Amino acid sequence: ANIIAPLLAPX
What we know:
Elements: H1 4-8
PDB class: antibiotic
Keywords: Peptaibol, Membrane activity, Beta-bend ribbon spiral, Aminoisobititic acid (Aib), Antibiotic
Assembly: monomeric
């Protein structure tokens, strides 16, 4: 779940 944390910041 560390690759979604940043990728989610924008979305």
